[PDB]
Symmetry: D2
Subunit: 122 residues, 4 copies
Amino acid sequence: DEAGITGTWYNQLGSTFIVTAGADGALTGTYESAVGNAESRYVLTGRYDSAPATDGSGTALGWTVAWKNNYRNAHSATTWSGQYVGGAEARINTQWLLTKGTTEANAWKSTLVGHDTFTKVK
Amino acid sequence: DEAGITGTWYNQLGSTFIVTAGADGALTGTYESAVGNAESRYVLTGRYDSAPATDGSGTALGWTVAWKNNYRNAHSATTWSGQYVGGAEARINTQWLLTKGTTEANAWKSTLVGHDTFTKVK
Amino acid sequence: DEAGITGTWYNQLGSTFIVTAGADGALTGTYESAVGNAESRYVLTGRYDSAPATDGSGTALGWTVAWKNNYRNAHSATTWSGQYVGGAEARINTQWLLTKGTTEANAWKSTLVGHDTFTKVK
Amino acid sequence: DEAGITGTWYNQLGSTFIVTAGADGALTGTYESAVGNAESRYVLTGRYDSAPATDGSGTALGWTVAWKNNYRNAHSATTWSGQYVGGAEARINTQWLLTKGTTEANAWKSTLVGHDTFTKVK
Ligand SMILES: [Ir+4]
Ligand SMILES: [Ir+4]
Ligand SMILES: [Ir+4]
Ligand SMILES: [Ir+4]
């Protein structure tokens, strides 16, 4: 699935996700959010199962973005956990955790949860 | 915090997390779970905010492990979203998402959620 | 929104959710899952904000189902946290947590996470 | 476990959770948060598995609080999904989802995730 994951992806919020899969299971690329305190590109890095079960199952994968680059620092980070589903309508369906730096007093409200779907089009 | 994150960490389940922080905000290392379908070490990769707010806030960070190495393939992946808290009792408090490859029929039950705390001792 | 929430709802998995809103903010009804270890109806109970912000915001709400009734006991429970969005395309968008009874050894893998969308049609 | 769940519980944040279990599997009571936009008591309602597996497994359960009462309205709701563990150190370990009413534009950032542990003491 190294081939199928590599490329440009778009989510329901209009975010852009550009990624390269390594044969060992590495994922490198950049992310650009369409929402929130973000601006231009951010590095992403991750892992994917480089030998998925041959039974029509998705390919598990994950990545992280620290929301710091040359333009802004949102003092936060998001990780995406999900699976790549290939074929004629190729999808990466994910749930994500966004954590932001907080004082220990405010740690209870430090983590947002949500879900994104990525397609090759739009 | 590049200095404080780098090193060996242990969580409440007895898992071992060895990590190196880059100055640009990179996190590389290996993970060894004490539970589940895992055996020996797995690559991890991630991002961390390399310039945290000076106000006593934690440092946001995240990483991913694809549960595939030379011994086993659990066809799954876990991402950790959380923050590093330094000082005399240094902690990485996280929530994690574990996704496993599934058929689209079973995608509703593909994702486990939980939380880990890492300390330098134990 | 007491009026708009009350009624029969359907989610993307084909599940059926029948609910009555009280004026005090109570939610009572029954749930029938289309997937998993479930069969016929299960009681649900919950709360909703009975005075939402007049600014075009959704109405926060939640409910719980213990997966035990006269036919089966899945020894689990699911809670839905989300918001009701009214108008011509009325939606309840939720994320859900499904916890199952486990031994303390297996507690790390006790909780599934996912998301459901409910509409009045389909 | 109807007996063991009923009573007053306290979490790591210093919140107070007073609950009555019905024999059918109902949970009614009040919640008082020690943090956030809350003040005095809020109704809670929920479900619990009223016949847990005899194998040393926890008892699955869940509840909801809409953050509206006579004093304040936070336009939000939280659901707790978890299990009751009895014995000499009785615990309700939960993960929780807090959703707040938002505009559809801001729905991506509407949901906080976290975890609470409740004990009978402190
Ligand atoms: Ir979806
Ligand atoms: Ir904790
Ligand atoms: Ir959705
Ligand atoms: Ir805990």
